[PDB]
Design a binder for this molecule. Sequence first.
Ligand code: MG
Ligand code: MG
Length: 758
Amino acid sequence: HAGMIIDADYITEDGKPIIRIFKKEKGEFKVEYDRTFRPYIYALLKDDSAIDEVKKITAERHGKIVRITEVEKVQKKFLGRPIEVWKLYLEHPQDVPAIREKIREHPAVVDIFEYDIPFAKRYLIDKGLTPMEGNEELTFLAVDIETLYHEGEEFGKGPIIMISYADEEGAKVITWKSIDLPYVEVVSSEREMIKRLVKVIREKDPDVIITYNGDNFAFPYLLKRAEKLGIKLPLGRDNSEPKMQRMGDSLAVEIKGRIHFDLFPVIRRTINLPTYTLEAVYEAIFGKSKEKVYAHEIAEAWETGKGLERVAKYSMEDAKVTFELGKEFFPMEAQLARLVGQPVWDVSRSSTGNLVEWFLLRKAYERNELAPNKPDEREYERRLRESYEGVKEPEKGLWEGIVSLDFRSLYPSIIITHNVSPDTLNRENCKEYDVAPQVGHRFCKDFPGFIPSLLGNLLEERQKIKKRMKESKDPVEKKLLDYRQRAIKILANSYYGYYGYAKARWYCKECAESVTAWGRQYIDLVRRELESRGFKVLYIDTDGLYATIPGAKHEEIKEKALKFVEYINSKLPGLLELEYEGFYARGFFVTKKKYALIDEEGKIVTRGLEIVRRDWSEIAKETQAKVLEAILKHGNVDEAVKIVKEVTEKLSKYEIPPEKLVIYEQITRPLSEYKAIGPHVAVAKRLAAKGVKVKPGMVIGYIVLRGDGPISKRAIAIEEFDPKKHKYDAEYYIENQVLPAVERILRAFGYRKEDLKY
DNA sequence: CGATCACGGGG
DNA sequence: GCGTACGTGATCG
Ligand SMILES: [Mg+2]
Ligand SMILES: [Mg+2]
């Protein structure tokens, strides 16, 4: 009708699917139902006569037989060529996985197509429906929880001790222990606290629930405790419970009628941080410090009853900043959803490769272009092993006053001008074609390629938005249009990468190679022009470069670089654009996407080097941090080498505290299901043998002891370690922990692993 | 060696 | 749900 679409799903009623379109119309929540949309797949047949055998194929589901309800001969395009396929209709979406392989196996069937598109996404495309359109203002509520945790406990063993929420009315805490603070609501039990959260959510009726890692912590924990306590969480606008969907090796939680906006996957994509803790994220965006109160401090305060006001303040600030962050990051995700035509829930949890693919599937429908299939495992593997011809090793040592230049806005223009598309690649009876330099791939000029055509329209639309922005007096429209033009830039700058993405439907190795080859001519021009101006290029890859004027004043480097970007863009034709990304006080480069820098404010910025993860010992992580600090903060590689040498000697002489040697690894399945027994599994099996209920999710802490053979047979549970009896493996902690953590970094300064010991 | 298995965020 | 990440690095067998 007239509302803004925020989501879509389907329900089954009397065994038949019903699409639900969740809308917001002038502040009101509305649900539209559609019983008429039918599931389907396509089948390419060897001959039209075959349909009589194919329409008679059946399968089984829910104890009943599955049939093809209707067949329809249709004319479409495949790889820029007319094709005749049969549209096979099914009653229920779940009929598609049940019957698709029985159609594909048929000797008269050449191939099948569009057999793995989810019904709700199939519906939005086919009906031309775009989520997040209009000026409809949504409501937001941030939610967070605090729990009682002890090292290595099964997930959900300890109770939820606090629940916090925040919106514009303020940040509040619900707890079941007496804390005298103005924003704290004290209730009688964990059960009563969870029921109060349910009431707040039902009363505030937010369109968007903001969490920080709610997909993999807050909501699975709430569901675990609600199950324990035997209470329901009717948070859905249809009174349904939050729904845990297995998205990869992890989880994603949906709340029907709403948008569960988990900031963790969103921020992980948007900015570069070594660790995405809420406190690190908040500081990077708002330039303010946020205190972290660790799990052990929380457990100690809860159990002893001392210092609970500190824990309540931590819980409050967690909800307060989650709200603040949500408001900051939601507008761009809303514009991306709109652009790609899929709900924010799905779009906020996806890579740019999937954003491109959703955009392309919709455009293929609009253009009557049959979509190619996602590859099988063998093809996906063959794609990962493909070698690309045509980005040198970076300069060694420590450099000062570094400018970063970004090339990414160059590639959409190359795709368009050279008609780079899988449907135009090495076409027969082509009258005119473009030949890629060095690699020689031919792209037909006779018709615009599917992908160049779409990119051309995206770039044109962005230029119209930018023009409308200059001519606007309304700062509200200007702010909105700024988000819209940034969403196009992000989607357009993702096509180059998408061509080489192994899971892509419109994958094209030769397209990616050719864009690289044509792109290189401009990169080489940028490099020569930089060097003619006294700049030294320290590092260069397909995405950008780092450069300096050796021994020049920093303000002179910045000014010359800004003046250079303005100059080159005046020389580059069309929408080919170079961007000044930033300036760094110092930096060093190891290899492709492995480097470390420090800006003028003293913030260290790295790519592909830092090892902040629980399965690496503290001694290795601490030494690595010390090495980066000595190099970047002190400009002293000699100090860094001496730090490594001192740590290794201390390890050899058993001078390192055993607490800095603990390795943590999660159990992810029943112990009997393991095919390879790593040290944490060997430790786990002994724990289960002692009567410990070992379950997936439990994190095993261990220390590697001195001895013969694989580390599996010498690992000990941290709770069993006796410093007066057990001797840790110094050679393991040196060669497998500390030295790999620092050897890549120090390779940039001409050191090998063997020069980092006395 | 190829195969297998872990990481992130949260408490 | 017409589904189940990603890319990378250590250790087992
Ligand atoms: Mg959904
Ligand atoms: Mg919290």
